[PDB]
Enzyme design. Sequence first.
Site, PDB file in Angstrom:
ATOM      1  N   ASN A  83       0.794  -1.232   0.000  1.00  0.00           N
ATOM      2  CA  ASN A  83       0.000   0.000   0.000  1.00  0.00           C
ATOM      3  C   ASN A  83       0.828   1.284   0.000  1.00  0.00           C
ATOM      4  OD1 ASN A  83      -2.121  -1.717   2.359  1.00  0.00           O
ATOM      5  ND2 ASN A  83      -2.344  -1.620   0.123  1.00  0.00           N
ATOM      6  N   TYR A  85       3.185   3.799  -2.174  1.00  0.00           N
ATOM      7  CA  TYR A  85       3.635   4.241  -3.494  1.00  0.00           C
ATOM      8  C   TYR A  85       5.155   4.370  -3.548  1.00  0.00           C
ATOM      9  CZ  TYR A  85      -0.844   5.850  -5.644  1.00  0.00           C
ATOM     10  OH  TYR A  85      -2.059   6.001  -6.297  1.00  0.00           O
ATOM     11  N   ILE A  90       1.617   6.759   1.715  1.00  0.00           N
ATOM     12  CA  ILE A  90       0.875   5.627   2.246  1.00  0.00           C
ATOM     13  C   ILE A  90      -0.601   5.726   1.855  1.00  0.00           C
ATOM     14  CG2 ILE A  90       0.248   4.334   4.311  1.00  0.00           C
ATOM     15  CD1 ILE A  90       2.600   5.775   5.720  1.00  0.00           C
ATOM     16  N   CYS A  91      -1.141   4.657   1.275  1.00  0.00           N
ATOM     17  CA  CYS A  91      -2.548   4.639   0.900  1.00  0.00           C
ATOM     18  C   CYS A  91      -3.309   4.029   2.066  1.00  0.00           C
ATOM     19  CB  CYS A  91      -2.767   3.805  -0.364  1.00  0.00           C
ATOM     20  SG  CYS A  91      -2.133   4.579  -1.852  1.00  0.00           S
ATOM     21  N   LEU A  92      -3.956   4.887   2.846  1.00  0.00           N
ATOM     22  CA  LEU A  92      -4.724   4.464   4.016  1.00  0.00           C
ATOM     23  C   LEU A  92      -6.103   5.120   3.945  1.00  0.00           C
ATOM     24  CD1 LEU A  92      -4.452   3.035   6.890  1.00  0.00           C
ATOM     25  CD2 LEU A  92      -3.709   5.279   7.734  1.00  0.00           C
TER      26      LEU A  92
END
Lengths: 154, 91
Positions: A83, A85, A90-92
């Site tokens: 998750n 990149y 951070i993709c949260l």
Amino acid sequence: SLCLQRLQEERKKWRKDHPFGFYAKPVKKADGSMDLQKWEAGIPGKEGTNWAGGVYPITVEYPNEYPSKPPKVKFPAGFYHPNVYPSGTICLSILNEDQDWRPAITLKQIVLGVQDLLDSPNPNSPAQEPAWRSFSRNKAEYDKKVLLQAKQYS
Amino acid sequence: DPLVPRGSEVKPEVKPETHINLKVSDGSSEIFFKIKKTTPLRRLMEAFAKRQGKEMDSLRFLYDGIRIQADQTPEDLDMEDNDIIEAHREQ
């Protein structure tokens, strides 16, 4: 501005009570004062997982529109996780204005959210192709890399 | 006729800016200490260590992620009342 006022409150609250093993603070400017809109923090890996032993550094950048808009959180570029990149972003879910972000979310919630994500990636947010592919189809290799990375940050 | 009130203002009792409370935690216990802002953290560190039954040299004390030197004072680190010091086993 409500932004700086809220950040002053977030700091007062965090410095008195925060998850053990974590650290977070505004970055110091040239004149000694704090840049409330840019913080450097550390997320400890959970014991009993392959992330244990490491303390992963993140930067939290609050936009001028915060708390209406969520802060951006980033690990160092190249950080290995499904998750995360290539830039380190951070993709949260709680950090996405179209998903679960809400003005009331605190720094504590954010850091615990990042920590929880380490050992439990969100399948609906594959931001790093090789990492997600390995996590999903080559667990043996994935685990090996996480263990090495844990030593890099311990 | 009206009463003649004769008063004087009591200046507010000043707030001693001398000591602060610090919470020291190792994940299993959180212990509060009250120390003078200009006193070295050494004493605090030792008292925590012996209360937990551990050797000073076996622990490292961090303030916002930065290791504390036994000779440093709360004032040197700009610490404030109720701030936190984390004790971790030394690598």
